[model samples]
Target: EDRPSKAPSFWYKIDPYRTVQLVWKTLPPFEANGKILDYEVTLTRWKSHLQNYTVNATKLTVNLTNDRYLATLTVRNLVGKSDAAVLTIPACDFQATHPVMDLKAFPKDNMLWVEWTTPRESVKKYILEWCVLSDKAPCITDWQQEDGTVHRTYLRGNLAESKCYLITVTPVYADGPGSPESIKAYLKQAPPSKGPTVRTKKVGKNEAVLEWDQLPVDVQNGFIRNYTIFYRTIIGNETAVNVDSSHTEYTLSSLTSDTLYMVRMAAYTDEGGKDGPEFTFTT
Candidate 1:
């Protein structure tokens, strides 16, 4: 009737050793033109190339002993031949590829972007995968079949607020799967849930040295950007100063003498802040 108009698709099954079983299933346009007659395949690793001719079968198996094997299959019919479909083969249990390096991850808007550098060796596909590490149960993982061309990959879509997701990029070499590179990224950050616990270490006529306990990791929904201290003489206007997150204490100097004062502390994230209990002191 006619020639096959579209390319066919295939999948690979590891043969437990140095070979991969490749098979495809297609009907109609792929074979309908008149029951496809045959298929030809070409494979390569590094600079060496191998070819296979499947006279009438839809299956082919080949030895894959490197990090990644490149294969192209062209389907044919009595009438016409379809376009060649390019495919990438993964690693088997016996051989593996080298690991990617310098896996760095960062929050993007609200999700994440993961970046890595592949080795100078032969190129292959990558499995960029991720899962929420904060899960209380077994890991629920997801992944993207990354093309062999990129050094960076994104999380694809929406990540919820403030969950730590561990991302990994595993290089698929003909030898086998290489060592995976990993990093943790946050989706969103909420302000610290509670303010730092405060204590007055010293007080004088015009100054007070204040100390506060650090916010616990669990209570900090996001990275603690900084701490803010609020102080004012009793029934007076309030003044605030930003304190570094690493500081457990901040000295309040240049105070008004012979006056009663109210002081409090707040913890801040990128989003907002939460105040601690207010305490009164006489200076």
Candidate 2:
């Protein structure tokens, strides 16, 4: 609910069958004892003021049976009224359309990497829009028409390291803007700050196999370059082995029998490495 203001607005579009649905809520603040009688919906097209339609409820559904492509709507209650809201009907004849879905953002080293699933419809182009939240009206800082076939892009340079950014992608057709999707994410570089959880199994009297699982996808800021395994006896020098990213398990042979060894592992990426907790096992 909202109090009546000078200007109350909304956005809309025309559907495939040349029909538009105008739904609005009353702006007049609710009263403990008062009730709404009726809502007056007025329309204005281009240069002329048309007759107003009155509804017992809040919504007015209309079909584009006439020549007007743009409409101005104003809502009024018994006491006060709201400012005019406009709806522009699209002239395109697309059978069906969809917006970009599953938009995701990853912040790494002052860069914001955005990715989304492609729309089902063949998009002619995409409008990448972004804005900083600190701005009063949140105007676009960057707006560019990109190739529709691509699903990922990055924003670099001049971006604050710890500010919030609102990003959206609008699918564009020959006629105009299709559905758009938006998301908000903070810009900061967060590496795989925590390493994998490891466990061990005895392969033989003199050998033990060490295993660890990968981090969750959200924490893997980038491709893990490799993993380093470090192990040694309780009071002995540490020995290290480098393993490829694909291999998460390693066998340690030539171990002193019935001796306790302390083992730990760390995974590395381009950004940095996260070392895991040390575990002790007897071989």
Candidate 3:
């Protein structure tokens, strides 16, 4: 009762000779209850012609003159052949005449809408690709195909608020896909999780210097519109001051000499914001 195991996992990369190299998961002792005799590879070109080959090694180097190739591979042995592993390989050899023009993307409630001007060259369809922008981590990416007659589309699934994503639109010709046009956008913004950490640089008789660090990108749920500083004289009266987001320091003037003051800073986006920790100073 011995046979090859599950379908293999594979990866493809560009080769030095302007070709494509494909490698599949090697058959191991446990995976292959029986010995593997050879590997079979079949590639289908755009013209619907199938190219089939068998080899002894785990890696295969193939020449491709088209824009893309669909491959199906299977392992064979004395017992039988394993299930087929399929792969989509982009040769990037023959490109479309031009990319779509004037492409733009916007994130709205539960959806991301994309608009573009159709290219002048003959077109087959459009491919919309999107991915979350995560620094130092693997990004989640997805794509969809649109009808050639349409220039507008929306992707509305698994989209999260307060996060930014990169969207790309590429034109597809009968032969291959063209260059991609991409931009960054965010879903509906909310207040930052927390505000900047505030500190008192110096205190004078009538003025005190206050400075704070900028909010980290991940926490700034939306584009920072401005910063609001709220200062009070020990619950006597509160004053609010608006400062440009670019400035990290502000001079709190017209203060009573030798009096205690309580201060807090808030970072605001288009919709709302959050307040930072409180700091006290005596001027």
Candidate 4:
């Protein structure tokens, strides 16, 4: 059964589903004086007062820290270089959709706050994930899952002091749950807590494992009971992820990996406790 069309009316779709891309064109393509130095590329959201839905990349940086395309990249020997460069990639590739997520980890409050934008506002549902890694690998083990519908959410839990976390968010469409947003990062290092610490263990002839402990109890006085993570390949390639209530311990796999990362963890309590120590793992 077909219903009658709305008689003789002129209407158009607003904010049509489309992808805005970033194209980088400079002289010599990131090579200067035959000596390639480190470079920075960032993909930031561009917005205006009138264009609420308008989105584009801005000041994208390229460096030793690269995490794009569901994984990370390896850029080597980039230091002291300034020249024109031209970069090109398929436009459809950038259009690949990942769940849009943002997170805030408050070690002072011991809580992790997550905010996300669904591909379809009518989607009205979501699924969230969290994980942790102990071996300095971008990959996480110990995954915790939950389901809900909210633009913003805060979780409470008892996290180790000075331990780093990797957090994730994915939107659930009527079709199904989409690919998860990459990890986001937050750290809980208050005054009472100490600085970064690395607990290392010899694992093999070519590799070793490092572990960092959780925050101290005196620091948990603020009573922040949750944690979160956020990640990206920008900002000096220093990405962060939240790993509250999901899992911990990462096993570095593959011998030919060449990406460096920094991990920081936050500790929270329920009764208004302060955050504990924040440990950074250099990988």
Q: What is the C-alpha RMSD of each candidate to the true structure, in Å?
A: 10.2, 11.7, 8.7, 24.4
Model 4 TM: 0.30
TM-score of each: 0.51, 0.44, 0.60, 0.30
* CA lDDT of every candidate: 0.73, 0.65, 0.78, 0.36
Q: Write one digit per residue (lDDT tens) for candidate 4, span 1-283.
A: 1111111111011111233232222223333333223333322222312111111221232221111211111121333323212122212223424466453444346666656653444543444545543444544333222334466665434555444556666554443345656554444533334322334443433343544455443333332445433222224543343445233333333322333333344434443322323333333
lDDT assessment of candidate 2: 0.65
What candidate 1 gets wrong by more than 4 Å, as runs, is 1-102, 106-111, 123-150, 156-158, 166-182, 256-259
Stretches > 4 Å off in candidate 3: 1-99, 107-109, 134-138, 173-179, 201-206, 256-258
Judged by lDDT, which candidate is best? 3
lDDT of 2 at 48: 60
lDDT, candidate 4, equals: 0.36
**Candidate 1 backbone collisions, by pair:** 66-174, 66-175, 67-173, 67-174, 67-175, 68-174, 95-175, 95-176, 96-175, 96-176
Candidate whose TM-score is highest = 3
For 1-283, candidate 2 gives per-residue lDDT tens digits of 4323533333343454356665544443443113445455555543565747767664567765434445455555445555565444454443335778898988775678888888777876666667765524545455444666878888643665435567877776654467778887766634466787667955457888888887654455456778889888868999999989898688998988889888888877666888888888786
lDDT of 3 at 169: 80
TM-score of 2: 0.44
State which candidate, 2 or 4, has the greater lDDT: 2
Model 3 Cα lDDT, one tens digit per residue, 56-157: 887888878645688888888788888886666665554445877888877755687889886667776666768876654565556665667888889745
